[PDB]
Amino acid sequence: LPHGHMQTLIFLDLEATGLPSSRPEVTELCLLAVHRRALEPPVPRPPRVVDKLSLCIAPGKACSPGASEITGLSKAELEVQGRQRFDDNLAILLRAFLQRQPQPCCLVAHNGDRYDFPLLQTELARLSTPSPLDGTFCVDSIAALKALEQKSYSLGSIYTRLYWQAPTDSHTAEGDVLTLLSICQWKPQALLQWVDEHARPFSTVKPMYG
Template identity: 25%
Template sequence: MKIYVNIYSLFLIKLQLEQASMWTLDLSSSVNKEAGLSPGKFTEIYAEKQGKRRLKVEKKSKLPSTKRRRMQLKQERNLTQCASQALEGDTYQSEIGLEEQVDIEKIPDPVPRGNFKPVTIPSRAPSIVVFDLETTDLIRGRHMPHITQIAAVGLENDAIFNTYIIPKIPIRETAMEVTGIVVTAGKMTVHGKCVDAEDITSGLLKFLNWLQTYQNVILVAHNGRKFDFPVLMNTVKSLKQSKMLFQSVEGCIDSLSVFKKVFPGQTNYKQETLMSSILGQTYGAHDAKEDILALSLLLKEAKLSKSETLSFSFSPIAQHALRFSAEKAKNVPSLHHLIAQGILKHATAENFAGSGLNFQHLKKNFQRDGEDGLRAIFVQKNCDGQPRISAAKRILDSVIPKLVDLFEKQD
């Protein structure tokens, strides 16, 4: 009986709404007529359109897919709120000034890994420029080496750029042995021969100006993603010349990934090995000029179209990876005992550390919001819209309970 009464009540309410709508429509028509205005045809048409739109929205809101989407958005809002509470501590709460002891430590914002999706160049063809750097040392953690030589060549016109740079820090002995570059009393020699060299500011500006003679530049370097591009981007950033670089450079390519696909089954993918096994040639490796000429020959031998070449590219802005790598080097040591105990796999620990978090941040999050806080920090979105660590159910269900058990035992 109650069901029938409820249905009848709903019917009456709907009928009253329809009558009110019609009364409003009639009233607007009569007002228009008395004022000597339009008889209300446009109002009627607009009201009819709005009625159809309202019915369409109402019908769509009842679909299972729409309901699922609403639940998903609600869950994301809850996760965001939970993550904010865990990251900001008591400062996220109201009436904080009334508390005697306040937890004001803020967990760092997530550092993105970098977006390495292929770039697209809608107008004009890309200009492929091969380049190479020689430096004072390798990249060691957060410490970037200084550039000692920059060389580049246009793949189509074979125009060459080459310059030597006086570094501001000493050249490591192993680097001197490999490259032959030595600086003594401000003078540079290469394998015992004196060469003209300049400071990094003028040398870099010359290189950037040379790049601007090309349009839609795609820079190619062998093993560039792990070495040449981070070093170049770090140098450009420190000299505040990023804008000038981005004016000409549209993308970057690590030729290592190209050759692994085009020339599969090699014993290794060092540039000297590839030159020997594919072209049957040797060359003076670890001289930037010799390296770019060799790499340009290998790229020509690959015989890729420009569209195929672009499929290996990524934006120079993707060097978020610079900061990600620096944070990883800084934070991974604090997670070694979690890896040793089998709580975190090495890849997960690297993602965690690279995002800007260490073991103490994990512990602080658990103290603030328990298991929910740990889950929230794993799935928190970074500025690229990607999960801070992982949103995969398999990883969450495997890692989170182990962390909870660890922290509960410590308490």
């Protein structure tokens, strides 16, 4: 194994203002931390023991029509609800939340490699403080499920393919994280093996934009 056995999997989803060339900004973030042991067909229930963090974040630029349509969030409404920007205080919060998880820790996000990870890297890079994620590992769950399954690889398509019922989470970062968790609990042992074999340092994720 490249980096030992992952002790925590943190299921992650970011929602944002638009697609990568638009130089988007995060508008919502959910982390759901699960211990390796809590992982080790009826849709699986989440483990009893989990840590969860879900935050709405005011962006500096407007959401695109499509972004607002899909995420149900807009810059205007985030500001009327007094949401703060992606800022130093947020980094304090993330660092403390990460500190409570046993290490090595691995982020897991659907399409993380092409979207969530580089965007997170970019948001954290503009802060004065070093990234709270520099000791953390990551994997993309699209690749994971492609390997476990050997077809659409959208989140809902996978879920329905495995469980033969429609997904029932909200259209939110947390809803997407919960659906992802369910999918990852389909073959938990095999998923953990794939994660262990394929985990890579978040510090090697290239920022989406600079």
